[PDB]
């Protein structure tokens, strides 16, 4: 009787929310950007290749300062390389070789990383003993760990396959926020360029907009058919894209909440594991199963180059914060640098 | 053209390289089992014979270091890491002979057996475990002789036609897993009949993961 | 902690041999390259020898090259200087020191007490000697080098060393910018080129000392005469 009506209340909500998305939906993203000029054809040669790694590469993370980044490989081994020199800087070795992720500290002085052991470890890379040492071993999510990102040296987010995120307290080791709401396991996350709002996407086919003081889910995002894979801010934080196993990129507005663009191609039918933009965001680079990273007009929705320089799957990339510069993974255990040529 | 420091940052890097090719040397004469199963399946006796989210035992039998990998806490989905153990030496797959009258509790609909014939058709069959030789261990012999003599294997099998005696109604239990196999060429199953105090478990991992050496060393070397 | 100890100095007569030994404790012997610097009685800082982690690169200053040897044992933390053929010029204090060389590190951090022996190329300027200070008042100190220290990766090879009377060198400024781990924010390096400054804030007491430039451009490594600050 109660449990009755109250699924009905809920149904009428979604609807409300769905009419109230159509009532703003007066134009399209393709609608407005037709007249602009396409960006071409986008060329990248392979700069850098980083061996080292004996084992899949699951993921990478650029360092603030656009030279420094870290790889994590099944091998049990967490890497730092100099992208500039191809000369790595500190060899972490794990003590699970499951690792699912990685991150970079915004000041460099700490790395993490996570997997089937359900425990988002700290390392500090700054010790007056001259190694690395474990700082912090993060427990309480109840499932693998897929994605971590710093906020500050003090305080970080995590996902897990749990179905549920986590804000940790460094310091005490205690998570201070959990973030609920997600039916299927959280698979990436994204923190805003503020660091004061952050976007998960999980097996759900769903991708939630959470406030991290508030620690409430703010905007819930659909559209996708299967499991959101990867996730990623525009760079100006009123945006964001999604990677999902249904073969499609798409591009939901936080204000207008909904969806707004599409990146999908018929010769693709492959799963995608990573998308990260450029630095004016105009390029949406998105890697996929089929051993390739293509390059997307994120305001077109137009394939503009691809990144086939792999001959496993890309199960990760990223873009240096000056824009400089992408770094794929790939489970061949290889990473490369690329940036195009005048 | 590098600086003082320059090289000596080269330097260092080579002396990280030096130490990731020992490692993976190494790692490359470890054995990673995966160990696999549903719920009462007896992988907890052969975990206990042979001595978080992953639990991982190591021990070392006849100068050979194996790493058995249990994921049977991992309550996720499993095609989201199943991946992750693409590359180990064997899968272990525990089989409950006397779960072959019982029911799911959870379900109470579909028989136990019927949920480890699926089980091991989703593993045997998976994408990432298309050349990876399987141990299937068959449990709980000794219970399984004391029920087929009161309950009928036809319960769980109707179109099994043979005698009610163990030496004829483990063979066809066997045969039905080994039938599931998609891939009868590029990968074998090595079947055995285990119990609660058979001492020869560990021995015949063995015996299957040095078969699974050489297959191994057959490719590597170009011959196969 | 971090802990460096000298032994086997004393008393020698010209031509003999002494072993110097250098006992690491508190950090990673192993991945540390190991420097041995002596200064002589009223002398300044002059760089001996260097091996690198791994024991892979080997340098020695052309005024001890076939006389001195320098080895480490990394299982036991142990760093070692085989003099034989010993003179007068030799008469030193020898200071144990460890450098780790990857990008954004900080060489030459860490010197140890010294042990004294007694026996019975990039020049770096530093014209000004002594330099009256008081309390509260900025003081600046240049150094100068032959050769430019900026090389074409971006990086000024110049350090700034500050030994307190009766203590070791201890590291101010690495690579004429960056402001050593500890040391307070009142110390800034500035320079380019050849010329470079090195500028103190509110100086207070524990400033008084002698500060040594060195740079690190390309071995042999080579230090400056030492500007002393006094009350």
């Known amino acids: 009787s109660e449990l009755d009506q109250l699924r009905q209340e809920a149904e009428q909500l979604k609807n409300q929310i769905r009419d109230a998305r159509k009532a703003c939906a007066d134009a399209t993203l393709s609608q407005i950007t037709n007249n602009i000029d396409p960006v071409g054809r986008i060329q990248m040669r392979t700069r850098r290749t980083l061996r080292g790694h004996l084992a899949k590469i699951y993921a990478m993370h650029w360092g603030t300062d656009s030279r420094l980044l870290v790889s994590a490989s099944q091998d049990g081994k967490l890497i730092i390389w100099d992208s500039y020199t191809t000369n790595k800087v500190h060899a972490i070795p794990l003590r699970s070789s499951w690792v699912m992720t990685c991150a970079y500290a915004p000041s460099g002085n700490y790395v993490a990383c996570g997997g089937l052991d359900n425990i988002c470890s700290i390392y500090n890379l700054k010790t007056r003993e001259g190694n690395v040492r474990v700082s912090r071993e993060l427990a309480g999510h109840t499932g693998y760990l897929s994605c971590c990102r710093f906020l500050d040296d003090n305080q970080i987010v995590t996902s897990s396959g749990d179905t549920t995120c986590a804000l940790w307290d460094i310091e005490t080791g205690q998570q201070t926020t959990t973030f609920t709401g997600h039916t299927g396991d959280v698979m990436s996350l994204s923190l805003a360029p503020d660091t004061r709002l952050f976007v998960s996407g999980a097996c759900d086919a769903s991708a939630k907009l959470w406030d991290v003081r508030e620690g409430m889910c703010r905007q819930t995002f659909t559209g996708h058919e299967s499991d959101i894979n990867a996730i990623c801010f525009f760079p100006n934080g009123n945006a964001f894209a999604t990677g999902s196993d249904d073969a499609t990129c798409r591009l939901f507005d936080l204000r207008a909440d909904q969806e707004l663009m599409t990146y999908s191609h018929d010769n693709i039918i492959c799963g995608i594991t990573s998308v990260s933009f450029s630095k004016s965001g105009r390029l949406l680079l998105a890697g996929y199963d089929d051993f390739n990273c293509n390059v997307w007009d994120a305001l077109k929705a137009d394939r503009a180059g691809v990144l086939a320089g792999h001959d496993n799957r890309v199960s990760c990339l990223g873009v240096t914060d000056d824009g400089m510069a992408v770094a794929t993974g790939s489970w061949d255990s290889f990473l490369k640098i690329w940036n195009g040529s005048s | 053209t590098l600086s003082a420091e320059d090289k000596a940052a080269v330097e260092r890097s080579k002396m990280i390289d030096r130490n990731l090719r020992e490692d993976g040397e190494k790692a490359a004469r470890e054995v990673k089992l995966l160990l696999l199963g549903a719920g009462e399946s007896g992988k907890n006796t052969i975990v206990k014979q042979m001595k978080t989210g992953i639990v991982e035992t190591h021990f070392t039998f006849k100068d050979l270091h194996f790493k058995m990998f249990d994921v049977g806490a991992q309550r996720s989905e499993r095609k989201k890491w199943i991946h992750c153990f693409e590359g180990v030496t064997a899968i272990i797959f525990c089989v409950a002979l006397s779960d072959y009258d019982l029911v799911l509790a959870e379900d109470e609909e579909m028989n136990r057996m019927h949920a480890s014939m699926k089980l091991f058709d989703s593993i045997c069959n998976n994408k990432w475990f298309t050349d990876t030789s399987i141990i299937l261990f068959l449990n709980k012999k000794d219970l399984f002789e004391e029920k087929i003599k009161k309950s009928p294997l036809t319960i769980c099998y109707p179109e099994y036609a043979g005698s009610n005696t163990y030496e004829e109604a483990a063979a066809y239990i066997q045969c039905q897993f080994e039938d599931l196999n998609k891939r009868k060429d590029t990968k074998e199953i090595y079947t055995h009949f285990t119990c609660s105090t058979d001492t020869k478990n560990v021995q015949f991992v063995f015996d299957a993961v040095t078969d699974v050496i050489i297959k191994n060393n057959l490719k590597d070397c170009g011959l196969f | 902690d971090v802990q460096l100890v000298e032994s086997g100095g004393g008393l020698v007569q010209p031509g003999g041999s002494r072993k110097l030994s250098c006992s690491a404790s508190?950090?990673?012997?192993?991945?540390?390259?190991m420097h041995w610097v002596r200064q002589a009685p009223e002398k300044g800082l002059e760089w001996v020898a260097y091996?690198?982690?791994?024991?892979?690169?080997?340098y020695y200053a052309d005024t001890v090259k076939g006389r001195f040897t320098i080895s480490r044992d990394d299982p036991k933390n142990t760093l070692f200087l085989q003099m034989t053929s010993l003179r007068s010029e030799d008469t030193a204090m020898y200071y144990c020191?460890?450098?780790?060389?990857?990008?954004?590190?900080?060489?030459?951090?860490?010197w140890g007490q010294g042990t004294t022996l007694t026996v019975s190329d990039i020049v770096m300027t530093q014209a000004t000697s002594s330099v009256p200070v008081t309390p509260g008042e900025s003081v600046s100190i240049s150094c100068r080098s032959s050769?430019?220290?900026?090389?074409?990766?971006?990086?000024?090879?110049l350090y700034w060393f500050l030994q307190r009377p009766g203590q070791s060198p201890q590291l101010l400024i690495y690579?004429?910018?960056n402001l050593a781990s500890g040391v307070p924010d009142r110390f800034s390096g500035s320079g380019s080129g050849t010329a470079f400054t090195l500028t103190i804030s509110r100086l207070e007491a524990e400033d008084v000392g002698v500060y040594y430039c060195?740079?690190?451009?390309?071995?042999?490594?080579?230090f400056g005469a030492g500007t002393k600050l006094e009350l």
């Open positions: 020191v460890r450098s780790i060389y990857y990008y954004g590190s900080s060489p030459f951090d860490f």
């Open positions: 508190g950090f990673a012997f192993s991945s540390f390259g």
């Open positions: 091996i690198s982690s791994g024991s892979g690169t080997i």
């Open positions: 050769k430019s220290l900026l090389h074409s990766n971006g990086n000024t090879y």
């Open positions: 690579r004429m910018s």
């Open positions: 060195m740079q690190h451009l390309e071995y042999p490594l080579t």
